[PDB]
Amino acid sequence: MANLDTQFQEFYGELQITVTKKQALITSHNNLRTKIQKYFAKNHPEYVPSFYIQGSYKMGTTIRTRDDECDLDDGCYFIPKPEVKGITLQNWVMDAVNGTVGATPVHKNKCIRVNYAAGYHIDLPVYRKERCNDNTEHPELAVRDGEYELSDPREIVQWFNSKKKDNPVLIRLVSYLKSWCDTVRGFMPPGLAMTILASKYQKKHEGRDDIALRDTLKSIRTALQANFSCVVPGTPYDDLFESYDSNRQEKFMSELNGFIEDADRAVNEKNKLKASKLWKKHLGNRFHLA
């Protein structure tokens, strides 16, 4: 039977942000920090922002999309707590990043998004927190449309770090699943959902990332068939699937069935080209035999 482990490793390589874009992302994220720091020093020095890279970039699971888009999440914290609405802190950050050359900001519900014409964006979730060095205190996320929400971005990173330890295939599995979401889109869940599901339900097959992904898909399906949910570690009741009606759930679980069916056929294929086409159908066009 065809062995596609090498093709999976090369696919993982193709999913990485390119050298040029990663340097531009980091340079831009440093420029944004200085721009925000200068804005508050000039206009509201009573509040001092501090920063913490979070999300996939901090966890080491970032992929570029099929359009070569990529991003970085940089949390913007105000300590101690400003006694203003969350939308007020967001508006100031939005005003601060406005005017960045080659970029246009967008005020999302839970972050300020800075879209760069060069093909990347930086998301700036805004937080307030009372104490500078207290990991037992969870920060409050600013929300445009409502009240602050308790959040635990650092706890997610710690949790995933413990799952990654002695387990380097996990970041590859998360990357494969994120590329699956990036290929189908529409009803598909976000990358954080793939991080949680792969970490909880991972199955291992040393030397065969193709078999490992197949086994992990079936493990995820078994868990979600019993209880269709995806709770964020450290934040109970933060269920990433809580808004999914029966239609969206059925669409996702049907796509998971089809992925599993084709993965089974690929693993049992003698023809390496056919096997690669079955995987590529769901993982996207950066997967190939050549």
Ligand SMILES: Nc1ncnc2c1ncn2[C@@H]1O[C@H](COP(=O)(O)OP(=O)(O)O)[C@@H](O)[C@H]1O
């Ligand atoms: N429902 C949520 N609860 C808590 N944190 C969230 C939630 N959604 C997003 N985040 C935070 O934003 C980060 C990025 O979310 P997401 O867009 O799914 O990841 P990616 O950076 O891979 O696109 C997550 O790592 C998490 O810290």
Ligand SMILES: Nc1ncnc2c1ncn2[C@@H]1O[C@H](COP(=O)(O)OP(=O)(O)O)[C@@H](O)[C@H]1O
């Ligand atoms: N609970 C959260 N904690 C931290 N960041 C978040 C959270 N939820 C969303 N984000 C960030 O905000 C981005 C988009 O926010 P979203 O909720 O999609 O706003 P909108 O509904 O306007 O699209 C996400 O990609 C993520 O990076």
Ligand SMILES: [Mg+2]
């Ligand atoms: Mg994001």
